[PDB]
Design an enzyme around this catalytic site. Sequence first.
Site, PDB file in Angstrom:
ATOM      1  N   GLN A  19      44.883  21.809  71.224  1.00 54.98           N
ATOM      2  CA  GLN A  19      44.309  20.489  71.435  1.00 54.98           C
ATOM      3  C   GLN A  19      43.201  20.169  70.431  1.00 54.98           C
ATOM      4  O   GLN A  19      42.792  19.018  70.300  1.00 54.98           O
ATOM      5  CB  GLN A  19      43.745  20.402  72.841  1.00 54.98           C
ATOM      6  CG  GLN A  19      42.634  21.385  73.054  1.00 54.98           C
ATOM      7  CD  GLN A  19      42.067  21.301  74.429  1.00 54.98           C
ATOM      8  OE1 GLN A  19      42.703  21.698  75.409  1.00 54.98           O
ATOM      9  NE2 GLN A  19      40.861  20.764  74.522  1.00 54.98           N
ATOM     10  N   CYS A  25      42.974  18.363  77.400  1.00 57.72           N
ATOM     11  CA  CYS A  25      43.721  19.387  78.097  1.00 57.72           C
ATOM     12  C   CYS A  25      44.493  18.883  79.287  1.00 57.72           C
ATOM     13  O   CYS A  25      45.483  19.497  79.705  1.00 57.72           O
ATOM     14  CB  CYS A  25      42.825  20.539  78.509  1.00 57.72           C
ATOM     15  SG  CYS A  25      41.349  20.372  79.585  1.00 57.72           S
ATOM     16  N   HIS A 157      38.629  22.331  83.437  1.00 62.21           N
ATOM     17  CA  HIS A 157      39.641  22.578  82.413  1.00 62.21           C
ATOM     18  C   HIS A 157      41.034  22.651  83.038  1.00 62.21           C
ATOM     19  O   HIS A 157      41.205  23.200  84.121  1.00 62.21           O
ATOM     20  CB  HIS A 157      39.342  23.892  81.683  1.00 62.21           C
ATOM     21  CG  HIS A 157      40.233  24.152  80.512  1.00 62.21           C
ATOM     22  ND1 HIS A 157      40.625  25.419  80.136  1.00 62.21           N
ATOM     23  CD2 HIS A 157      40.794  23.308  79.611  1.00 62.21           C
ATOM     24  CE1 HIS A 157      41.386  25.346  79.060  1.00 62.21           C
ATOM     25  NE2 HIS A 157      41.504  24.074  78.721  1.00 62.21           N
ATOM     26  N   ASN A 173      47.212  28.395  77.907  1.00 60.36           N
ATOM     27  CA  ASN A 173      46.091  27.538  77.547  1.00 60.36           C
ATOM     28  C   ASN A 173      46.536  26.680  76.369  1.00 60.36           C
ATOM     29  O   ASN A 173      47.626  26.882  75.827  1.00 60.36           O
ATOM     30  CB  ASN A 173      44.873  28.379  77.150  1.00 60.36           C
ATOM     31  CG  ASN A 173      43.562  27.608  77.275  1.00 60.36           C
ATOM     32  OD1 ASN A 173      43.560  26.397  77.497  1.00 60.36           O
ATOM     33  ND2 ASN A 173      42.443  28.312  77.132  1.00 60.36           N
TER      34      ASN A 173
END
Length: 208
Positions: A19, A25, A157, A173
């Site tokens: 990202q 995110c 997150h 992630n």
Amino acid sequence: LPEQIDWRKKGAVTPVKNQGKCGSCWAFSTVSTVESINQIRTGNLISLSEQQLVDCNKKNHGCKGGAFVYAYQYIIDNGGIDTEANYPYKAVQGPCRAAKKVVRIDGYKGVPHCNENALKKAVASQPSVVAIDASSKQFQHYKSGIFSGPCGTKLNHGVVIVGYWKDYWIVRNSWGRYWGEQGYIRMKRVGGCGLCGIARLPYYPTKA
């Protein structure tokens, strides 16, 4: 239910993405689950556009943040999302472009909160998005092994659970290949609301 499952090994997960210096995110995690459910239902693995959400998902705030629910809703209302190739990521919000509706979903469902047994059941069916507290330095500098904290339960997150083992969740992630284990992190299953609050707010897309 399987004792262990890894959707990466079943061909339902695209290569790790990054990202960059943009708070998107919420988009990377949500889009990842859509790419996966599409492959599970149709057999076709396609990389989709996060940039489209960053630019066009008005209920959310581009690089400033967003919520899973509005992201999935946007995809549904808009009638579909375009591919990464047709609408590339820039790591900055820009004018919303007209886009092709390549992949579509029918809806989304939330998993019961702070119930890892229910979360396990959902992950066994398809990758699911979850929110975690990634503010600790230990998490931000994680490199390998089974992460066991420390970390709080303040959600800030968004990531995706793409599998599990008896003692840990396999988490994808969106910080590129050079963070953690090639972009992934194995988080210990501790019950309750989960490590770093991972079991607090799970969702997954649906597609008939």
